[PDB]
Amino acid sequence: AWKVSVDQDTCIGDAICASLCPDVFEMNDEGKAQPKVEVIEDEELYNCAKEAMEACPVSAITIEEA
Amino acid sequence: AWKVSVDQDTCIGDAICASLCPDVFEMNDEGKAQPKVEVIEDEELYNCAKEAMEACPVSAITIEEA
Numbered sequence: 001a002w003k004v005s006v007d008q009d010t011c012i013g014d015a016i017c018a019s020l021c022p023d024v025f026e027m028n029d030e031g032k033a034q035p036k037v038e039v040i041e042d043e044e045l046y047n048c049a050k051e052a053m054e055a056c057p058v059s060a061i062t063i064e065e066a
Numbered sequence: 067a068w069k070v071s072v073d074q075d076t077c078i079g080d081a082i083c084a085s086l087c088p089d090v091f092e093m094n095d096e097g098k099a100q101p102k103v104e105v106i107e108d109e110e111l112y113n114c115a116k117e118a119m120e121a122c123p124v125s126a127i128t129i130e131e132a
């Protein structure tokens with residue numbers, strides 16, 4: 001399983017992650033992204049998370065495997 | 067790039083990780099594993115880190131992608 005993280009101190013609210021993967025990322029009341037789900041096992045969702053991580057212009061997103 | 071982590075509270079010093087991947091894991095003075103390197107970009111090393119993560123009998127190891 002994978003767990004996504006959005007560094008709130010890095011994120012500038014570009015939102016391309018939420019664009020690419022709205023099932024995994026949502027905007028919060030500070031205009032930053034955060035994960036909508038606390039675990040991913042679905043391969044398709046994992047793949048769009050990785051796409052979002054690769055696209056963030058400020059490198060705010062990380063993904064952990066266990 | 068990837069970063070390994072070994073939860074010191076979880077690890078019981080089984081050491082199969084160090085067996086499978088001695089370039090990535092070493093034993094420390096408390097009898098627990100820890101990462102020898104702070105970053106992996108080599109695919110071979112990543113692969114044997116993932117093998118070690120899948121083999122740990124107590125699930126002490128995790129790997130983060132950025």
Ligand code: F3S
Nearest residue numbers: 011012013015017056
């Ligand atoms: S700036 Fe923030 S809103 Fe998404 S694309 Fe990067 S984590």
Ligand code: F3S
Nearest residue numbers: 077078079081083122
């Ligand atoms: S118990 Fe510890 S020594 Fe390695 S195989 Fe698991 S992290």
